[PDB]
A paper describes a structure:
In prokaryotes, the [name] protein is important for survival under conditions that include DNA-damaging radiation.
With two major exceptions, the ADP-bound [name] was quite similar to the previously published structure of apo [name]. In addition to the classical helicase motifs, the ADP-bound [name] structure identified a motif N-terminal to motif I that interacts with the adenine base of ADP. [name] motif I, also known as the Walker A motif or P-loop, primarily binds the α- and β-phosphates through backbone interactions whereas motif I Lys37 is poised to stabilize the presumed γ-phosphate position of ATP.
Author numbering: 2 to 282, 288 to 578
The structure:
Amino acid sequence: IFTLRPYQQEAVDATLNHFRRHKTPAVIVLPTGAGKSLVIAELARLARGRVLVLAHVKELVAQNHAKYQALGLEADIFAAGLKRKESHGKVVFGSVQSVARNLDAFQGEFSLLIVDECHRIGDDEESQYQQILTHLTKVNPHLRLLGLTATPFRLGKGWIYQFHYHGMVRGDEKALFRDCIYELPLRYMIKHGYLTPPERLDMPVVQYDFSRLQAQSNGLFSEADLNRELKKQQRITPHIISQIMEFAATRKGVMIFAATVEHAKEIVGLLPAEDAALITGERDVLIENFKAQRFRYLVNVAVLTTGFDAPHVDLIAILRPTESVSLYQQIVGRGLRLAPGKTDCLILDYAGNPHDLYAPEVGTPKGKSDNVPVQVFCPACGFANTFWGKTTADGTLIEHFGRRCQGWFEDDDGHREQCDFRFRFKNCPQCNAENDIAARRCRECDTVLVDPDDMLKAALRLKDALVLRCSGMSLQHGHDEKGEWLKITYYDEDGADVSERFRLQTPAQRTAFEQLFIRPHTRTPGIPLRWITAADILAQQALLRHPDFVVARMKGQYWQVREKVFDYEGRF
Ligand SMILES: Nc1ncnc2c1ncn2[C@@H]1O[C@H](COP(=O)(O)OP(=O)(O)O)[C@@H](O)[C@H]1O
Ligand SMILES: [Mg+2]
Ligand SMILES: [Zn+2]
Ligand SMILES: [Zn+2]
């Protein structure tokens, strides 16, 4: 009694093809509710020896075992508190702690290791995980390792894999997994009826202003920063909860996603007495009480409970800002389990989060809250990159902060490489090769690339050269006998200024202008500025930025601009 949905057969096929050509671990990205047990079952059926499904969380180990056996198949379990029964079946489910101390039971053939929730590996039970890995690779030197996760990306931690099979890089060489070989988007499950569809309320009455907040190192939000502005706007909290109650009269189950513990307890109070509970992050804490509708409301703070299956949840109310589209999708998905008569799950966002469940995950920290995902084509390979940026109403790009194309390619010989097109770069002083902005040594000639502070410090002390911190630039143009020209004047807050001039008459002059001024100064690298006359440059000065520092050699007529520091991070 097992036939595979098309997307499940695809995940199996992707795994077989990968390991028939490679030894390296790979990861599959599946959302909850996809039916991971069916993929495991068919992989085990085709396997030599046995298959081990390992998981850090013992609670998850027991669920996977349950769902697998519910397919009409047999398996062992190695979890704490359980006793070794008659070993039966081709699959073994276990936890990192239990397996790492019952390693004497794994002296047989294990051809495949499936690690569920593989995004946790860098967090906990790391010594024991190496213990399991060392033992399995000495018994099975050709063992294959498949990762499963619904959350490949975590803010502050990075991506779990480097190469995505659709043609883009996500992590760098430090990524735990070399490859993501299959991904099932949440959009596909909703579109094809594998999950209940969400329906977000378009116009909430009042919502929190969460734009002024500045993220910490991780890109996350501090509890204190969230609380500062929650208490600034706490006269809106009564009104938002009032409408949640109004919507809940037409719904069945209600989850509330609050920002802090201070915010939650306030929320529970405004809710009807005995009609609301709370989920921190002891036990089930009334998990099946909620599913028996002992209470209509269940508030939750930054704690995701693995395994929650509540088809009765008809309503999700998000009152916390979401730092990532991926976090928003894990929150929404908890109310998308199918049920008869459940036409949708109403989503009530009162935090000002964007209205796009299917937005692309940039995968890098935002920086400024007004930035949005923007699409930027690579001039070299044509890959459609997605960077942080800003647009007009029509969608016309104003700025984008991408630095390198994220595409990769692999040649017939099997050699793989990321696209080398660099939207932002620095030239090597010796060989002129284009290098990453952060590089300390040239990639082609290994010459030292001077830090911005050090070059400035030498010219700041040695005043034979001029140094100027730039607050902005002004543009001027005219027309002499050899043709048009454009003069740029760089100035500081105290009025000192350095100027440079570009002629614009000859083809070589125009080419040099684009090479030396536009492409460095442009706000949208990779999208050429269209221009005929110098006045066209002036009209489009919004698309240009000014350097943060200007260094000029105090020589020539008055000075000759030599260095320009863009995107400066350091002393000043
Ligand atoms: N090929 C299939 N045929 C019939 N039912 C399926 C199939 N694949 C998945 N399902 C059903 O879809 C649901 C998957 O939910 P769940 O087991 O929680 O997925 P996961 O374990 O990946 O979170 C289960 O109710 C399961 O019976
Ligand atoms: Mg399953
Ligand atoms: Zn490219
Ligand atoms: Zn060089």
